[PDB]
Ligand binder design. Structure first.
Ligand SMILES: OC[C@H]1O[C@H](O[C@H]2[C@H](O)[C@@H](O)[C@@H](O)O[C@@H]2CO)[C@H](O)[C@@H](O)[C@@H]1O
Length: 404
């Protein structure tokens, strides 16, 4: 019979690729359907380029793709409309904001799979050791705590110890980190939902100068090459006070054999001042049936399975990844394993989106401009004032003649 082939997630990031292959194989066994899993590179912008080769070719060689939350506007032509396959009641079991995000010109491009938000990981043992009772609420507090704890841990002989790690590589992850910096300084959304390109302002410029000031000081010089996993590995070895990352890192840091098991918590990222908005960049993954799949019925069935309550529960319990079904946030087993799912729910609900709705199919070009200009601040090439001006100009060229 048919072989249903899935491209989604990556074995290069934590357990997500291994787990996804396990889920697809479970579906195959349950239904008596042959399946194959095609692996992907770690970074989402690299995954997009890979998948675009198949789409450009109208290739039937992948039936189901795991797509980023920023992609529906780009990928819609390549997606089978799922709307006729789901009842209104089935669709209402997901968060309506995510179903909306996935709907482009009426086409339900994909089912919500897991959501995501940037959060602050912190070493509770170290905060206690150095006389701190709570994680930092402001970026200045974060800098002060990092400097003090670094001074102490270095003096004690840990030459590998840093204050803060994050994603500073030039790729989509840096657009996420930078939106959080900019938005948490009251600098706006880079491109506002209405289309206004707002980034050329002093709050945005200050946010980027602040981030530059961390590099080689409280963060490694090499942070300008870090994606999720490079940051995670410094952190998980016990060598960073703080880390910005996504929910997946939590289960991995709690695993048996992790040096930091039981030594950390999570909270909302800091902000410039008490009246700035909290920033958590919205992330996550959706499940798309290929427009070019020869087996739409079977592929839909697989996507419904992967998006089901029990599969999302397993993702939550074993991989600490955020459900797209509100009902799971009240499930006793999800909450006993990840109590912070409840504590941080309002942070996840108020997550700030990158400008993928307003940029639509041009989002990847906009993001590349963002991460390249931001990276130029991190590397010391430009100051934040020049970078936000240059970024404004670049995005204006990209979006000229584009309307949402
Ligand atoms: O790098 C930006 C990218 O980060 C997040 O995706 C992670 C996800 O959290 C991990 O579980 C795993 O799948 O790797 C991805 C990073 O490569 C966001 O979900 C995503 O929206 C964002 O673009």
């Amino acid at each position: 019979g048919p072989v249903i082939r899935v491209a989604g997630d990556s074995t290069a990031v934590g357990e997500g690729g291994r787990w996804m292959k396990e889920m697809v194989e479970a579906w195959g066994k349950k239904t008596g359907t042959r399946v194959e899993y095609i692996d992907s590179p770690a970074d989402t912008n690299d995954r997009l380029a890979l998948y675009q080769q198949y789409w450009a070719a109208r290739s039937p060689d992948v039936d189901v793709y795991m797509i980023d939350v920023i992609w529906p506007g780009i990928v819609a032509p390549h997606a089978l409309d799922l709307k006729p396959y789901l009842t209104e009641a089935e669709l209402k079991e997901f968060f309506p904001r995510i179903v909306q995000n996935n709907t482009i010109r009426g086409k339900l491009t994909s089912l919500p799979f897991f959501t995501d938000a940037g959060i602050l990981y912190y070493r509770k043992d170290l905060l206690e050791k150095y006389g701190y009772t709570s994680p930092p609420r402001t970026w200045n507090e974060l800098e002060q705590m990092a400097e003090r704890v670094m001074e102490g841990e270095r003096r004690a002989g840990n030459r590998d110890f840093w204050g803060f790690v994050f994603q500073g590589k030039p790729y989509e992850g840096l657009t996420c980190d930078a939106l959080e910096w900019i938005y948490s300084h009251g600098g706006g959304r880079i491109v506002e939902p209405d289309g206004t390109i707002s980034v050329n302002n002093g709050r945005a410029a200050l946010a980027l100068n602040r981030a530059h000031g961390w590099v080689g000081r409280i963060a490694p010089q090499g942070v300008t090459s870090y994606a999720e996993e490079e940051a995670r590995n410094v952190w998980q070895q016990g060598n960073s006070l703080f880390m910005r990352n996504w929910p997946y890192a939590y289960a991995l840091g709690q695993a048996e054999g992790s040096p930091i098991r039981g030594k950390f918590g999570v909270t909302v990222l800091p902000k410039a001042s008490a009246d700035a908005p909290n920033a958590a960049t919205l992330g996550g993954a959706q499940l798309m049936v290929s427009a070019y799949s020869r087996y739409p019925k079977e592929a839909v069935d697989l996507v419904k399975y992967l998006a089901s309550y029990e599969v999302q529960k397993d993702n939550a319990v074993r991989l600490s990844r955020l459900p797209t079904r509100p009902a799971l946030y009240t499930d006793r087993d999800v909450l006993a394993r990840n109590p912070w799912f409840r504590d941080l729910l309002p942070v996840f609900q108020n997550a700030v989106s990158r400008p993928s709705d307003v940029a639509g199919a041009r989002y990847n070009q906009v993001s590349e401009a963002i991460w390249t200009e931001v990276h130029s601040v991190l590397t010391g090439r430009k100051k934040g004032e020049q970078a936000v001006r240059d970024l404004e100009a670049r995005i204006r060229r990209i979006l000229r003649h584009h309307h949402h």
